[PDB]
Design a protein around this ligand. Structure first.
Ligand code: HEM
Ligand SMILES: *[C@@H]1O[C@H](CO)[C@@H](O[C@@H]2O[C@H](CO)[C@@H](O)[C@H](O)[C@H]2NC(C)=O)[C@H](O)[C@H]1NC(C)=O
Ligand SMILES: *[C@@H]1O[C@H](CO)[C@@H](O)[C@H](O)[C@H]1NC(C)=O
Ligand SMILES: *[C@@H]1O[C@H](CO)[C@@H](O)[C@H](O)[C@H]1NC(C)=O
Ligand SMILES: *[C@@H]1O[C@H](CO)[C@@H](O)[C@H](O)[C@H]1NC(C)=O
Ligand SMILES: [Ca+2]
Ligand code: NA
Length: 595
């Protein structure tokens, strides 16, 4: 009865079966179902979607319509009463660097992107949602509750547009709405290279046959490369300072300039590509541009994989790591490699790891100038501080030397994100990421908290007292019950993140299961996984085994002092060493001798 499936707005596929390299789109990874993991298809549904009308309308759309007999609470009221806090003193994670937060965002952006519907071009339909807050079609505005401070200074709502969905981009009325993943599900550096042939070519430097990615020609970082500007008007990064008039960057991923540390990480990875490509040109002078591009691309892909799977996931998942992602046993072509709709909310655990300030540090790892520490809200879409205020190096030192925010049941999301978020088009530092996440949860038709607990083989609390035992927090459980009325109706984003963290990790049991399962699948179901026999030679793999994040910094900045375990909390100068003592990526195994 379940159909072979739709796909009129998704194009053709034809697959070069000899090809030792990934496609840009993700097509052809899986030989029996070539579209599996490819960009611009439906996110996978691990559980049936749950919408108000069975099909497409989110819970909370129709005021009289309940969920399980109760009204769903406003996203912004859940934000105000649970997610927020005032005192930033004491929130910092004593054993994770700020790099730990930032790598999470990098990895997330490699795997999933569900962009807003395209309806407001040649059309003030976006402007009208904003201006008048009238719910309809793809406008699904986040209404302020009665006592909200923003009601006084900001109007009736925050605008919000429904995520794009496959088949039609107007609505459909027979099968349930499926949102699109616009990037490749494989952990494949698509955030560097693009997920679309169009973008991917535009990012390359073809002017020369050196397999280089294109770089900024207007500005340089003390001789080091910046990303090229995106010259597409209008631009949010110009808007945040019209006197500086520095545009956003153009990268493999649309979101690269959303905050200055992300743009920073993107810069390092672009540098790493060009550097690898130059080093390969030396070792194999006979290689053409396509060859060089592909081979650097492939190494960078492996780099992301290793840092993610060897260094990042164990310190997120802790004791549950082995339970969900056992040691690798090879490529299983029966595994679904697709990112699930629910993972795209699970991985938003990072939002509770983002701290209120970003610092620039000098070569002694001491404050850099008089405005060294800045509030995070002043750095959304901010390229001008990079270009006109010291380049990336002082930012990278902050990444190493400052700390991530630790998630806290009484201090979930900093007001920098919770009250001051800037979104493009819209003019103000006045949005709420937490409210947006909850509204999105609904937009995407997510099953509730207890449906996912059941999925993960965990208990399903029905009462206040049951919820108190699961959360190990009486007061939080009590606010959730007062808002949601039953635990079944608690939005997964908030329920998942309300759980106390597992031992040695930074997420609770439910999230560790949703994340662990996904990463297991992105590893096991990828034909081009770096450790799958034949992707790299045995010797290449011995060389790739030594990648570190420290080495990445050494090779692509003018920073000479680095920790060995860059994700742990590290204090200068004690936990820092000279770049000369840190293992290098030895590219000798890529010398292809053929005479
Ligand atoms: C200053 C730091 C960050 C900012 C400003 C930020 C901002 C945002 C914004 C605006 C969205 C879109 C919300 C929506 O429309 O539904 C979003 C989505 C997301 N964020 Fe963050 N974020 C940050 C850090 C992180 C971190 C550290 C992680 C993970 C470790 C993360 C994971 C995600 C994910 C998974 C999504 C959904 C992506 C998709 O499929 O579309 N973010 N973030
Ligand atoms: C917009 O960018 C300008 C350009 O960098 C910023 O002005 C700089 O800031 C201080 C003065 O307070 C000086 O050290 C720089 O030399 C300034 N340059 C210029 C041209 O004035 C300005 O602070 C930014 N404005 C905002 C609102 O972000
Ligand atoms: C392309 O590469 C050449 C040779 O390295 C370089 O001089 C030129 O600036 C590059 N162009 C861009 C846009 O990166
Ligand atoms: C391959 O995947 C399928 C479904 O996930 C599973 O039945 C099988 O156990 C997997 N193979 C191995 C070797 O684990
Ligand atoms: C800090 O984190 C590392 C992993 O980065 C861990 O092995 C170490 O034991 C942790 N230190 C403390 C004090 O918990
Ligand atoms: Ca990807
Ligand atoms: Na062997």
């Amino acid at each position: 009865s379940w159909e072979v499936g739709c796909g009129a707005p998704v194009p053709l596929v034809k697959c070069d079966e000899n090809s030792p390299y990934r496609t840009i789109t993700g097509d052809c990874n899986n030989r029996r179902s070539p579209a599996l993991g490819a960009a611009n298809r439906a996110l996978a549904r691990w559980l049936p979607a749950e919408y108000e009308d069975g099909l497409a309308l989110p819970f909370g759309w129709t005021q009289r319509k309940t969920r399980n007999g109760f009204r769903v609470p406003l996203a912004r009221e859940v934000s105000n009463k649970i997610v927020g806090y005032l005192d930033e003193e004491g929130v910092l994670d004593q054993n994770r660097s700020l790099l730990f937060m930032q790598w999470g965002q990098i990895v997330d952006h490699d795997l999933d992107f569900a962009p807003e519907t395209e309806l407001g071009s040649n059309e003030h339909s976006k402007t009208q949602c904003e201006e008048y807050c009238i719910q309809g079609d793809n406008c699904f505005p986040i209404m302020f509750p009665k006592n909200d401070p923003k009601l006084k200074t900001q109007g009736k709502c925050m605008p919000f547009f429904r995520a794009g969905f496959v088949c039609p981009t107007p609505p459909y009325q027979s099968l349930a709405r499926e949102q699109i993943n616009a990037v490749t599900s494989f952990l494949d550096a698509s955030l560097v290279y693009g997920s679309e042939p169009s973008l991917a070519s535009r990012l390359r430097n073809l002017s020369s046959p050196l397999g280089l990615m294109a770089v900024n020609q207007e500005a340089w970082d003390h001789g080091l490369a910046y990303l090229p500007f995106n010259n597409k008007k209008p631009s949010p990064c110009e808007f945040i300072n019209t006197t500086a008039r520095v545009p956003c960057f153009l990268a493999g991923d649309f979101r690269a300039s959303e905050q200055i540390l992300l743009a920073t990480a993107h810069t390092l990875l672009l540098r790493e590509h060009n550097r690898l490509a130059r080093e390969l040109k030396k070792l194999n002078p006979h290689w053409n541009g396509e060859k060089l591009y592909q081979e650097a691309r492939k190494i960078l892909g492996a780099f992301i994989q290793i840092i993610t799977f060897r260094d990042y996931l164990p310190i997120v998942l802790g004791s549950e790591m082995q339970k969900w992602i056992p040691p690798y046993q090879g490529y299983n072509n029966s595994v679904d490699p697709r990112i699930s709709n629910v993972f795209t909310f699970a991985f938003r655990f990072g939002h509770m790891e983002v701290p209120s300030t970003v610092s620039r540090l000098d070569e002694n790892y001491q404050p850099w100038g008089p405005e060294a520490e800045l509030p995070l809200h002043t750095l959304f879409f901010n390229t001008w501080r990079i270009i006109k205020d010291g380049g990336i190096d002082p930012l990278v030192r902050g990444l190493l030397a400052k700390k991530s925010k630790l998630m806290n049941q009484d201090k979930m999301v900093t007001s920098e994100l919770r009250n001051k978020l800037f979104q493009p088009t819209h003019k103000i530092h006045g949005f709420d990421l937490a409210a947006i996440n909850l509204q999105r949860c609904r937009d995407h038709g997510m099953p509730g908290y207890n449906s996912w607990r059941g999925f993960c083989g965990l208990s399903q609390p029905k009462t206040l007292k049951g919820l108190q035992t699961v959360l190990k927090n009486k007061i939080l459980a009590k606010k959730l019950m007062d808002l949601y009325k039953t635990p079944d109706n608690i939005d997964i984003w908030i329920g998942g993140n309300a759980e106390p963290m597992v031992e040695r990790g930074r997420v609770g049991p439910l999230l560790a299961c949703l994340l662990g399962r996904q990463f297991q699948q992105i590893r096991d179901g990828d034909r081009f996984w770096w450790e799958n026999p034949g992707v790299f030679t045995e010797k290449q793999r011995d060389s790739l085994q030594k990648v570190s994040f420290s080495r990445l910094i050494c090779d692509n900045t003018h920073i000479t002092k680095v920790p060995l375990h860059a994700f742990q909390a590290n204090n200068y100068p004690h936990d820092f060493v000279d770049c000369s003592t840190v293992d290098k990526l030895d590219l000798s195994p890529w010398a292809s001798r053929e005479n």
